[PDB]
C-alpha cells in the first residue's frame, strides 16, 4: 500500500487499527512510534473504445 501521516489519534496501548473485515487502515512503526495510515494504491479496469 501507500503510507500517509495519519490524523486519527491512538490510545497509548493499541498497535494498529481496522474499519471493516480486518482491513488494516492504520499502524504504528516499531521504532519512531508514529501513527501511520495504510490505503491501497490505485487500481482499475481498462477499456478500449
Amino acid at each position: 500500500g501507500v503510507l500517509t501521516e495519519s490524523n486519527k489519534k491512538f490510545l497509548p496501548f493499541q498497535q494498529f487499527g481496522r474499519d471493516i473485515a480486518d482491513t488494516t487502515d492504520a499502524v504504528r512503526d516499531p521504532q519512531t512510534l508514529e501513527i501511520l495510515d495504510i490505503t491501497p494504491c490505485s487500481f482499475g479496469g481498462v477499456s478500449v473504445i
Binding site: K8, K9, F10, L11, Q14
Partner: protein, 86 residues
C-alpha cells in the same frame, strides 16, 4: 467498603466513538430486545417483528431395549458335571 463481582462467558456489542473510545455497550443475553439488537447489529430497532434465534427441546435421558428373553449356555453342565476325562 468495596464491591466484588464475577465474570462469565457472555457476548457484547460495543459502539466505538469517532475518537476511538467506547461510548456504549449492549449485553447480548439479557433481554429479548438485547437479542434483537445483536441480530440486527445495531443499537436502535424500528417497529416490526424479527427472528432472533431458534428454540430446541433437548433430550432428557436415554433408553435401550432388546429381545424379551435370553436364550440360555451349557456352562452349568460343562463346569458342574459329574465326571471329567483324564
Amino acid at each position: 467498603a468495596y464491591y466484588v463481582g464475577y465474570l462469565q462467558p457472555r457476548t457484547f456489542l460495543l459502539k466505538y466513538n469517532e475518537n476511538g473510545t467506547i461510548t456504549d455497550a449492549v449485553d447480548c443475553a439479557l433481554d429479548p430486545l438485547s437479542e434483537t439488537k445483536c441480530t440486527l447489529k445495531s443499537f436502535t430497532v424500528e417497529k416490526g417483528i424479527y427472528q432472533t434465534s431458534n428454540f430446541r427441546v433437548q433430550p432428557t435421558e436415554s433408553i435401550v431395549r432388546f429381545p424379551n428373553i435370553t436364550n440360555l449356555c451349557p456352562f452349568g453342565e460343562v463346569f458342574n458335571a459329574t465326571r471329567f476325562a483324564s
